[PDB]
Amino acid sequence: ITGTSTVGVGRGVLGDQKNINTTYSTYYYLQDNTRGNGIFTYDAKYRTTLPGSLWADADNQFFASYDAPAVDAHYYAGVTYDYYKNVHNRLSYDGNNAAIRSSVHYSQGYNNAFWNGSQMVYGDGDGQTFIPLSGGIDVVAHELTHAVTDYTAGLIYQNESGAINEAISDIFGTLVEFYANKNPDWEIGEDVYTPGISGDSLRSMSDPAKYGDPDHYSKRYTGTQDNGGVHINSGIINKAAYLISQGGTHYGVSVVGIGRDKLGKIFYRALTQYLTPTSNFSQLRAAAVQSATDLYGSTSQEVASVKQAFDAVGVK
Ligand SMILES: [Ca+2]
Ligand SMILES: [Ca+2]
Ligand SMILES: [Ca+2]
Ligand SMILES: [Ca+2]
Ligand SMILES: [Zn+2]
Prior knowledge:
Elements: E1 4-11, E2 17-25, E3 27-29, E4 31-32, E5 39-43, E6 53-54, E7 56-57, E8 61-62, H1 68-88, E9 100-104, E10 113-115, E11 120-122, H2 137-151, H3 159-180, E12 187-188, E13 203-204, H4 225-229, H5 234-246, E14 248-250, E15 253-255, H6 260-274, H7 281-296, H8 301-312
Parallel strand pairs: 1-8, 5-9, 9-11
Antiparallel strand pairs: 1-2, 2-3, 3-7, 4-5, 5-6, 10-11, 12-13, 14-15
Helix pairs in contact: 1-2, 2-3, 3-5, 3-6, 5-6, 5-8, 6-7, 7-8
Residues 138, 174, 177, 185, 187-188, 190 line the site of one calcium ion.
Protein backbone atom coordinates (compact mmCIF):
# COMPACT_ATOMS: atom_id res chain seq x y z
CA ILE A 1 0.00 0.00 0.00
CA THR A 2 0.85 3.70 -0.27
CA GLY A 3 1.30 5.40 3.10
CA THR A 4 3.91 6.55 5.60
CA SER A 5 6.52 4.42 7.28
CA THR A 6 5.85 3.92 10.92
CA VAL A 7 7.08 1.74 13.79
CA GLY A 8 4.83 -0.47 15.90
CA VAL A 9 5.47 -2.88 18.76
CA GLY A 10 4.31 -6.38 19.55
CA ARG A 11 5.08 -9.75 21.04
CA GLY A 12 6.38 -12.77 19.12
CA VAL A 13 5.52 -16.48 19.34
CA LEU A 14 7.92 -16.94 22.28
CA GLY A 15 6.47 -13.97 24.20
CA ASP A 16 9.38 -11.68 23.35
CA GLN A 17 8.63 -7.99 22.72
CA LYS A 18 10.02 -6.28 19.63
CA ASN A 19 9.60 -3.27 17.33
CA ILE A 20 8.44 -3.78 13.75
CA ASN A 21 8.40 -1.51 10.73
CA THR A 22 4.87 -0.86 9.54
CA THR A 23 3.05 1.43 7.06
CA TYR A 24 0.18 3.77 7.99
CA SER A 25 -2.81 4.59 5.75
CA THR A 26 -6.12 4.26 7.73
CA TYR A 27 -4.77 1.01 9.19
CA TYR A 28 -1.22 0.10 10.21
CA TYR A 29 0.01 -2.63 7.85
CA LEU A 30 2.78 -5.14 8.30
CA GLN A 31 4.80 -3.43 5.54
CA ASP A 32 8.42 -2.52 6.18
CA ASN A 33 9.49 0.10 3.62
CA THR A 34 13.07 0.32 5.02
CA ARG A 35 14.37 -2.90 3.42
CA GLY A 36 14.58 -3.07 -0.39
CA ASN A 37 11.25 -2.98 -2.20
CA GLY A 38 9.64 -3.90 1.13
CA ILE A 39 8.79 -6.78 3.47
CA PHE A 40 5.03 -7.59 3.47
CA THR A 41 3.31 -10.01 5.84
CA TYR A 42 -0.16 -11.46 5.19
CA ASP A 43 -2.97 -13.20 7.10
CA ALA A 44 -3.97 -16.52 5.45
CA LYS A 45 -6.91 -16.84 7.99
CA TYR A 46 -6.56 -20.64 8.39
CA ARG A 47 -7.12 -21.13 4.62
CA THR A 48 -4.70 -22.32 1.95
CA THR A 49 -5.45 -19.47 -0.42
CA LEU A 50 -2.33 -17.31 -0.83
CA PRO A 51 -1.13 -14.75 0.02
CA GLY A 52 -4.30 -13.81 1.96
CA SER A 53 -4.80 -10.26 3.23
CA LEU A 54 -2.01 -7.77 3.89
CA TRP A 55 -1.86 -7.70 7.68
CA ALA A 56 -3.78 -4.68 8.98
CA ASP A 57 -3.95 -3.45 12.55
CA ALA A 58 -5.95 -0.59 14.08
CA ASP A 59 -3.43 0.72 16.64
CA ASN A 60 0.09 -0.40 15.63
CA GLN A 61 0.35 -2.61 18.75
CA PHE A 62 0.64 -6.33 18.06
CA PHE A 63 0.12 -8.10 21.38
CA ALA A 64 -2.82 -10.42 20.59
CA SER A 65 -2.05 -14.14 20.52
CA TYR A 66 -3.32 -14.12 16.86
CA ASP A 67 -0.68 -11.40 16.06
CA ALA A 68 2.29 -13.40 17.35
CA PRO A 69 3.13 -15.52 14.21
CA ALA A 70 2.76 -12.35 12.04
CA VAL A 71 5.10 -10.32 14.31
CA ASP A 72 7.82 -12.99 14.04
CA ALA A 73 7.46 -13.75 10.29
CA HIS A 74 7.75 -9.98 9.64
CA TYR A 75 10.56 -9.32 12.14
CA TYR A 76 12.68 -12.36 11.21
CA ALA A 77 12.37 -11.69 7.46
CA GLY A 78 13.96 -8.25 8.19
CA VAL A 79 16.77 -9.88 10.21
CA THR A 80 17.44 -12.34 7.37
CA TYR A 81 17.44 -9.44 4.86
CA ASP A 82 19.96 -7.64 7.08
CA TYR A 83 22.17 -10.71 7.34
CA TYR A 84 22.39 -11.12 3.55
CA LYS A 85 23.00 -7.38 3.01
CA ASN A 86 25.55 -6.74 5.78
CA VAL A 87 27.35 -10.07 5.57
CA HIS A 88 27.25 -11.02 1.83
CA ASN A 89 26.39 -7.64 0.28
CA ARG A 90 23.25 -9.26 -1.15
CA LEU A 91 20.10 -7.17 -1.54
CA SER A 92 17.14 -9.47 -0.85
CA TYR A 93 16.78 -12.97 -2.34
CA ASP A 94 17.20 -11.93 -5.99
CA GLY A 95 20.12 -9.55 -5.29
CA ASN A 96 17.93 -6.72 -6.60
CA ASN A 97 15.91 -5.82 -3.47
CA ALA A 98 12.88 -7.95 -4.49
CA ALA A 99 9.90 -7.51 -2.16
CA ILE A 100 9.68 -10.26 0.49
CA ARG A 101 6.20 -11.68 1.12
CA SER A 102 5.15 -14.03 3.98
CA SER A 103 1.79 -15.54 4.99
CA VAL A 104 0.95 -16.85 8.47
CA HIS A 105 -2.01 -18.82 9.87
CA TYR A 106 -1.76 -21.00 6.82
CA SER A 107 -4.37 -23.80 7.04
CA GLN A 108 -5.46 -25.45 10.31
CA GLY A 109 -2.93 -27.12 12.61
CA TYR A 110 -0.38 -27.21 9.76
CA ASN A 111 2.95 -28.64 10.96
CA ASN A 112 5.24 -26.99 8.41
CA ALA A 113 6.48 -23.90 6.58
CA PHE A 114 7.88 -23.43 3.10
CA TRP A 115 9.08 -21.15 0.34
CA ASN A 116 6.64 -21.76 -2.56
CA GLY A 117 8.58 -20.09 -5.40
CA SER A 118 6.89 -16.68 -4.77
CA GLN A 119 6.68 -16.28 -0.99
CA MET A 120 7.13 -17.72 2.48
CA VAL A 121 4.26 -19.67 4.10
CA TYR A 122 3.94 -20.62 7.79
CA GLY A 123 1.62 -23.02 9.58
CA ASP A 124 0.54 -22.52 13.21
CA GLY A 125 1.36 -26.15 14.12
CA ASP A 126 -1.06 -28.41 15.98
CA GLY A 127 0.23 -27.25 19.38
CA GLN A 128 1.88 -30.62 20.06
CA THR A 129 4.39 -31.21 17.29
CA PHE A 130 4.84 -27.47 16.62
CA ILE A 131 3.86 -24.01 17.74
CA PRO A 132 3.56 -21.34 14.95
CA LEU A 133 6.60 -21.96 12.78
CA SER A 134 7.60 -18.32 12.16
CA GLY A 135 8.55 -18.31 15.86
CA GLY A 136 11.91 -19.81 14.87
CA ILE A 137 14.51 -17.46 13.40
CA ASP A 138 16.35 -20.42 11.83
CA VAL A 139 13.06 -21.61 10.33
CA VAL A 140 12.36 -18.19 8.75
CA ALA A 141 15.92 -17.81 7.43
CA HIS A 142 15.84 -21.44 6.17
CA GLU A 143 12.74 -20.76 4.06
CA LEU A 144 14.06 -17.37 2.82
CA THR A 145 17.32 -19.07 1.89
CA HIS A 146 15.37 -21.38 -0.47
CA ALA A 147 14.57 -18.14 -2.35
CA VAL A 148 18.26 -17.19 -2.49
CA THR A 149 18.93 -20.67 -3.90
CA ASP A 150 16.10 -20.36 -6.48
CA TYR A 151 17.82 -17.25 -7.83
CA THR A 152 21.41 -18.51 -7.84
CA ALA A 153 22.27 -22.24 -8.11
CA GLY A 154 18.67 -23.29 -8.81
CA LEU A 155 19.27 -26.70 -7.12
CA ILE A 156 16.51 -29.19 -8.10
CA TYR A 157 14.56 -30.37 -5.04
CA GLN A 158 15.32 -34.07 -5.45
CA ASN A 159 18.01 -36.60 -4.47
CA GLU A 160 21.54 -35.20 -3.91
CA SER A 161 20.89 -31.74 -5.37
CA GLY A 162 17.75 -31.48 -3.19
CA ALA A 163 19.73 -32.58 -0.13
CA ILE A 164 22.25 -29.83 -0.91
CA ASN A 165 19.35 -27.38 -1.32
CA GLU A 166 18.10 -28.31 2.17
CA ALA A 167 21.60 -28.18 3.70
CA ILE A 168 22.16 -24.69 2.25
CA SER A 169 18.95 -23.49 4.00
CA ASP A 170 19.98 -25.17 7.28
CA ILE A 171 23.49 -23.66 7.06
CA PHE A 172 22.27 -20.11 6.41
CA GLY A 173 19.30 -20.38 8.81
CA THR A 174 21.83 -21.23 11.50
CA LEU A 175 24.23 -18.44 10.39
CA VAL A 176 21.31 -15.97 10.65
CA GLU A 177 20.47 -17.31 14.13
CA PHE A 178 24.11 -16.65 15.19
CA TYR A 179 24.05 -13.24 13.48
CA ALA A 180 21.00 -12.26 15.56
CA ASN A 181 22.78 -13.65 18.65
CA LYS A 182 19.50 -15.11 19.87
CA ASN A 183 20.37 -18.24 21.87
CA PRO A 184 22.25 -19.51 18.84
CA ASP A 185 23.04 -23.20 18.20
CA TRP A 186 23.58 -25.76 15.44
CA GLU A 187 20.13 -27.34 15.77
CA ILE A 188 17.18 -26.60 13.49
CA GLY A 189 13.70 -25.58 14.72
CA GLU A 190 14.35 -25.93 18.46
CA ASP A 191 12.32 -22.74 19.26
CA VAL A 192 9.09 -24.04 17.65
CA TYR A 193 9.31 -27.89 17.82
CA THR A 194 7.45 -29.94 20.52
CA PRO A 195 6.46 -27.32 23.12
CA GLY A 196 6.04 -30.19 25.62
CA ILE A 197 9.66 -31.42 25.34
CA SER A 198 12.74 -29.32 26.15
CA GLY A 199 16.10 -29.67 24.41
CA ASP A 200 15.09 -31.42 21.17
CA SER A 201 14.76 -30.11 17.60
CA LEU A 202 13.93 -31.20 14.07
CA ARG A 203 17.52 -31.66 12.94
CA SER A 204 21.07 -31.33 14.35
CA MET A 205 23.99 -30.09 12.26
CA SER A 206 26.63 -30.90 14.86
CA ASP A 207 25.33 -34.48 15.24
CA PRO A 208 22.71 -35.35 12.61
CA ALA A 209 22.55 -38.96 13.85
CA LYS A 210 21.02 -37.63 17.09
CA TYR A 211 17.72 -37.55 15.16
CA GLY A 212 18.25 -40.40 12.70
CA ASP A 213 20.00 -38.47 9.92
CA PRO A 214 23.18 -39.76 8.21
CA ASP A 215 26.50 -38.15 9.12
CA HIS A 216 28.44 -40.09 6.45
CA TYR A 217 27.94 -40.76 2.73
CA SER A 218 28.00 -44.53 3.32
CA LYS A 219 24.87 -44.14 5.44
CA ARG A 220 22.96 -42.12 2.83
CA TYR A 221 19.28 -42.86 2.24
CA THR A 222 18.82 -44.32 -1.25
CA GLY A 223 15.00 -44.67 -1.49
CA THR A 224 12.24 -42.46 -2.84
CA GLN A 225 10.56 -41.03 0.26
CA ASP A 226 11.01 -37.31 1.04
CA ASN A 227 11.99 -36.54 -2.59
CA GLY A 228 14.90 -39.00 -2.38
CA GLY A 229 15.85 -38.00 1.18
CA VAL A 230 16.31 -34.23 0.87
CA HIS A 231 15.78 -33.62 4.64
CA ILE A 232 17.69 -36.80 5.49
CA ASN A 233 20.82 -36.74 3.32
CA SER A 234 21.15 -33.03 4.14
CA GLY A 235 22.72 -34.44 7.38
CA ILE A 236 25.91 -35.38 5.53
CA ILE A 237 26.35 -31.82 4.23
CA ASN A 238 25.21 -30.17 7.51
CA LYS A 239 27.86 -32.24 9.30
CA ALA A 240 30.55 -31.18 6.79
CA ALA A 241 29.54 -27.51 7.26
CA TYR A 242 29.61 -27.88 11.05
CA LEU A 243 33.11 -29.42 10.88
CA ILE A 244 34.43 -26.66 8.55
CA SER A 245 33.22 -24.06 11.07
CA GLN A 246 33.87 -25.68 14.45
CA GLY A 247 36.31 -28.48 13.65
CA GLY A 248 36.39 -31.89 15.26
CA THR A 249 37.12 -35.52 14.62
CA HIS A 250 34.51 -37.58 12.82
CA TYR A 251 35.01 -41.19 11.68
CA GLY A 252 38.73 -40.92 12.54
CA VAL A 253 39.22 -37.89 10.27
CA SER A 254 40.45 -34.66 11.94
CA VAL A 255 39.22 -31.20 10.93
CA VAL A 256 40.63 -27.83 12.00
CA GLY A 257 37.77 -25.30 12.27
CA ILE A 258 37.92 -21.95 10.48
CA GLY A 259 34.87 -20.30 12.09
CA ARG A 260 31.33 -19.29 11.06
CA ASP A 261 32.25 -16.19 9.03
CA LYS A 262 34.52 -18.16 6.72
CA LEU A 263 32.08 -21.08 6.44
CA GLY A 264 29.49 -18.50 5.33
CA LYS A 265 31.84 -16.88 2.83
CA ILE A 266 32.87 -20.22 1.37
CA PHE A 267 29.31 -21.63 0.98
CA TYR A 268 27.86 -18.32 -0.28
CA ARG A 269 30.53 -18.20 -3.00
CA ALA A 270 29.89 -21.88 -3.81
CA LEU A 271 26.16 -21.27 -4.03
CA THR A 272 26.40 -18.09 -6.16
CA GLN A 273 29.33 -19.05 -8.40
CA TYR A 274 29.73 -22.80 -8.81
CA LEU A 275 26.61 -24.81 -7.94
CA THR A 276 24.13 -25.72 -10.71
CA PRO A 277 20.56 -27.19 -10.66
CA THR A 278 21.85 -30.78 -10.84
CA SER A 279 25.03 -30.54 -8.72
CA ASN A 280 25.66 -33.70 -6.62
CA PHE A 281 27.66 -34.07 -3.34
CA SER A 282 30.94 -34.64 -5.20
CA GLN A 283 30.37 -31.41 -7.11
CA LEU A 284 29.50 -29.54 -3.89
CA ARG A 285 32.88 -30.63 -2.51
CA ALA A 286 34.61 -29.29 -5.68
CA ALA A 287 32.57 -26.07 -5.52
CA ALA A 288 33.48 -25.51 -1.84
CA VAL A 289 37.19 -26.31 -2.43
CA GLN A 290 37.24 -23.94 -5.43
CA SER A 291 35.51 -21.19 -3.40
CA ALA A 292 37.93 -21.50 -0.48
CA THR A 293 40.77 -21.35 -3.08
CA ASP A 294 39.43 -18.13 -4.67
CA LEU A 295 39.10 -16.51 -1.27
CA TYR A 296 42.12 -17.73 0.73
CA GLY A 297 44.61 -19.37 -1.64
CA SER A 298 45.02 -23.00 -2.67
CA THR A 299 47.55 -23.86 0.10
CA SER A 300 45.46 -22.11 2.79
CA GLN A 301 44.24 -23.64 6.07
CA GLU A 302 40.73 -22.86 4.80
CA VAL A 303 41.10 -25.05 1.69
CA ALA A 304 42.73 -27.83 3.77
CA SER A 305 39.83 -27.74 6.27
CA VAL A 306 37.14 -28.01 3.55
CA LYS A 307 38.87 -31.08 2.12
CA GLN A 308 39.19 -32.61 5.58
CA ALA A 309 35.51 -31.90 6.40
CA PHE A 310 34.34 -33.55 3.18
CA ASP A 311 36.76 -36.48 3.75
CA ALA A 312 35.27 -36.89 7.24
CA VAL A 313 31.74 -37.37 5.86
CA GLY A 314 32.99 -39.67 3.09
CA VAL A 315 32.41 -37.27 0.18
CA LYS A 316 35.19 -37.26 -2.42
CA1 LIG B 1 -3.47 -4.03 17.53
CA1 LIG C 1 18.52 -21.40 19.14
CA1 LIG D 1 18.72 -23.25 15.80
CA1 LIG E 1 10.78 -29.07 21.96
ZN1 LIG F 1 13.77 -26.49 3.34
